[PDB]
């Protein structure tokens, strides 16, 4: 399962995980909410989300997501605190930053998040029982996640 | 506009295309010439070179006054290239003098499809 980021003549650190048992829409929002940051503050911000000090704002998947006071300056009024998505994204970020530092003695002080991609993967199929003798599905939406770090975008 | 710069003119307006309530013909433009309130007073502006300025690129389109319309001084005109609807309500210039623009004032169906039996020569 290939990389979607196909830039050339740049020095990047790449990491990726395929088939992740976590909500696709939650994980997508987490990655888009950290896109563009320096890596130090992306880690600080992810830890803050884990501790309910900041939020993830929700574009593109928001019907039923509640409005909250910590979304007061982001462009929307809607956000949440996806804890499993934050776990996965922190681990993939550490992999990418380690890759970049070990491939070039570049510091965390000139690294930024410059690209992400999330896609939908094949789910686990269980079943649930409905009234009047019926049976319906109880699937999951797992995801493919990649994440790219490199030098300041301009 | 570096060719018609010094050329003084009589003012006009492009009000619309020739139409009925069902149909609209974009080949012919309806044009209002100042001081022309009568069908008979259109003789003097008949056959004259005119021009409009298309905003983008700032360049003019050249055309000619062809025919009267109604009883009240309206005229029909044909331009080098048929006009976009955006240009309505804009001004038209009627030149007092002569300019040789060559073939660049005459409509496209007369320019090509005019039937001189123009054989494509191939040199």
């Amino acid at each position: 399962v290939k990389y979607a980021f196909k830039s050339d003549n740049l020095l990047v650190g790449k990491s990726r995980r395929d088939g992740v048992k976590a909500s696709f829409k939650n994980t997508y929002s987490t990655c888009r909410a950290i896109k563009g940051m320096g890596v130090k503050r992306a880690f600080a911000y992810l830890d803050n989300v884990l501790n309910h000090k900041e939020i993830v704002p929700f574009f593109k998947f928001y019907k039923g997501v509640g409005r909250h006071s910590q979304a007061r300056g982001s462009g929307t009024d809607k956000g949440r605190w996806p804890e499993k998505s934050v776990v996965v994204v922190k681990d993939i970020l550490k992999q990418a930053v380690s890759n970049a530092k070990h491939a070039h003695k570049k510091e965390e002080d000139e690294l930024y998040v410059i690209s992400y991609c999330v896609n939908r993967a094949r789910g686990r199929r269980r079943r649930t029982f409905r009234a009047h003798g019926r049976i319906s599905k109880y699937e999951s939406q797992p995801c493919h996640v990649e994440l790219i770090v490199g030098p300041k975008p301009l | 506009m570096e060719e018609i710069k010094g050329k003084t003119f009589l003012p006009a307006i492009f009000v619309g295309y020739q139409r009925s309530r069902a149909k609209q013909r974009e080949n012919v433009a309806l044009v209002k010439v100042s001081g022309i309130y009568t069908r008979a007073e259109t003789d003097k502006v008949l056959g004259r070179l005119i021009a409009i300025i298309h905003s983008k690129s700032g360049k003019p389109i050249f055309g000619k006054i062809c025919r009267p319309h109604g009883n009240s001084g309206m005229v029909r005109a044909r331009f080098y290239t048929n006009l976009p609807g955006q240009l309505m309500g804009h001004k038209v210039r009627v030149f007092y003098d002569n300019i040789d623009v060559g073939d660049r004032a005459t409509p496209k169906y007369e320019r090509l499809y005019g039937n001189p039996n123009a054989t494509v020569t191939y040199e």
Partner: protein
Amino acid sequence: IHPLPHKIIIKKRKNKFIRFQSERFVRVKPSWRKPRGIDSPMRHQYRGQRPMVSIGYGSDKETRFMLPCGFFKHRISTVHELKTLFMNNKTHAAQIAHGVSARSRKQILEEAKKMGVRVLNADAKL
């Protein structure tokens, strides 16, 4: 490499005749069909509908099938066919069939340049 002068080429319609309601459904292809419904608006040809095919659009018989460069077309695969079809011809130019390889495109192109035939896909495979 030049044809004889001809009458001016006239195309009576410039766009393609497109199937009714093919813009709404992916499953309905743009290939032309004849409307045949009892309440069909395009069958009735009320105003504002798409134009309909008829023999009134056909091209003038002297210019029909003539390519923009003024030559009629022959489609060939071998040097034998090239020689045969362009023995004493001043109205057609040749075209190489798409399946012919580079090795033999060389030889066809040389023989055509000798004879004095124009080829319309000269520089396909370098």
